[PDB]
């Protein structure tokens, strides 16, 4: 409706008998391919991303926001638990880091 791409903002300009809209949009640019999983199996529990998506570069699993590659360590603050590992099709085994555990250890 307001240009091609994800609309950021628009600026009007008058014209003879009409209007011109300068639409400013965000266009994703340099895509890379990754392995993906719908959920992560850890301690017999299924973890789903709170806001992003699980990705793998080949050896390591991260969670990233969906529109811009920004890999982060998969933690309990990054994900939420729902059920066990037996239902989700394509669930992948990986560790989920608990921030409170090192603090309790130290």
């Amino acid at each position: 409706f307001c240009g091609k791409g994800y609309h950021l903002m628009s600026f009007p300009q008058s014209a003879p008998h009409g209007v011109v809209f300068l639409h400013v949009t965000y266009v994703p640019a340099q895509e890379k391919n990754f392995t993906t999983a719908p959920a992560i199996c850890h301690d017999g529990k299924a973890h789903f991303p709170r806001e992003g998506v699980f990705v793998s570069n080949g050896t390591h699993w991260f969670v990233t926001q969906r529109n811009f590659y920004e890999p982060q360590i998969i933690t309990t603050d990054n994900t939420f638990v729902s059920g066990n590992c037996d239902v989700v099709i394509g669930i992948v085994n990986n560790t989920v880091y608990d921030p409170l555990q090192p603090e309790l250890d130290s």
Binding site: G5, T36, A39, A46, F48, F80, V87, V88, I89
Partner: protein
Amino acid sequence: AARDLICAQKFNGLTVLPPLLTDEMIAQYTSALLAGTITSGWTFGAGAALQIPFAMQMAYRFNGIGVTQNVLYENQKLIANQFNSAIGKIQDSLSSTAS
């Protein structure tokens, strides 16, 4: 000619021009739109088509309507079956009903 109104129309100067796009070209456009949607979700509408597994795209769409994505993943077979039945009903209705 007597049993056809088109011949009388033509003989009195009234003609029909063909559309620029053929039916085959329009079907190609719709198949391209469908392939983009089912392989890349809404990404191809905003830029390059970014592939994503279809169940994960459905999890995205479930988030879009305020349902957590574990609901999609834990009910994936049921949701696929419901969609398949609904498509079959569309096809049966188009085959049977006449207008």
